[PDB]
Amino acid sequence: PCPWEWTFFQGNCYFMSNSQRNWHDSITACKEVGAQLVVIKSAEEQNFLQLQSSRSNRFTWMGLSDLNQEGTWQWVDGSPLLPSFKQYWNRGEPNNVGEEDCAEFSGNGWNDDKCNLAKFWICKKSAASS
Numbered sequence: 001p002c003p004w005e006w007t008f009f010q011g012n013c014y015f016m017s018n019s020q021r022n023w024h025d026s027i028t029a030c031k032e033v034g035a036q037l038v039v040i041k042s043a044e045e046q047n048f049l050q051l052q053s054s055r056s057n058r059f060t061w062m063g064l065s066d067l068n069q070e071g072t073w074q075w076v077d078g079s080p081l082l083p084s085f086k087q088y089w090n091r092g093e094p095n096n097v098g099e100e101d102c103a104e105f106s107g108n109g110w111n112d113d114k115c116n117l118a119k120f121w122i123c124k125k126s127a128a129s130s
């Protein structure tokens with residue numbers, strides 16, 4: 001079972017925060033609970049997490065950025081953003097407006113936004129590690 005206040009899906013536990021943090025502080029918060037700011041590995045996990053964020057009406061960080069090389073999106077575990085996953089950007093994203101280097105769930109897909117903006121966040125860790 002997942003810890004109190006967490007969400008189970010496909011053998012992992014997810015913490016949907018109830019406070020807001022900028023993207024770096026969200027990474028730290030997840031590391032504090034032995035988790036990671038969420039790295040999506042499958043289409044079904046994307047569809048699941050996207051829906052949680054859309055129906056909660058909450059702009060939410062995930063563990064994805066182009067801070068290192070503009071236009072090259074990397075997950076916080078080092079894995080590249082696969083071209084097929086680029087289907088999950090909202091229409092007209094990522095658009096880098098005013099420089100935007102971190103990815104959030106926004107509505108029915110992903111947006112790039114300012115990494116120093118405070119948003120809700122989602123951490124992920126194995127249920128077996130919980």
Ligand SMILES: COC(=O)[C@H]1C[C@H](OC[C@H]2O[C@H](OCCN=[N+]=[N-])[C@@H](O)[C@@H](O)[C@@H]2O)[C@@H](O[C@H]2O[C@H](CO)[C@@H](O)[C@H](O)[C@@H]2O)C[C@@H]1C(=O)OC
Pocket residue numbers: 093095097098100111112113
């Ligand atoms: C300069 O950044 C802003 O201040 C501003 C940027 C977006 O509003 C301005 C744009 O509106 C129109 O574009 C629609 C989506 N955008 N783009 N680009 C268009 O008239 C443009 O000429 C303007 O630059 C808006 O950004 C938020 O929403 C878009 C999605 O619509 C998203 O991509 C952004 O990441 C951001 O969440 C608002 C933003 C602002 O500062 O509030 C006014």
Ligand SMILES: [Ca+2]
Pocket residue numbers: 066067070099100101
């Ligand atoms: Ca940049």
Ligand SMILES: [Ca+2]
Pocket residue numbers: 066067070071096099100101102112
């Ligand atoms: Ca960018």
Ligand SMILES: [Ca+2]
Pocket residue numbers: 093094095096097100111112113
């Ligand atoms: Ca954007």
Ligand SMILES: [Cl-]
Pocket residue numbers: 001002008
């Ligand atoms: Cl559970």
Ligand SMILES: [Cl-]
Pocket residue numbers: 027031035036037076077
């Ligand atoms: Cl991490």
Ligand SMILES: [Cl-]
Pocket residue numbers: 099100101102113114115116
């Ligand atoms: Cl940024």
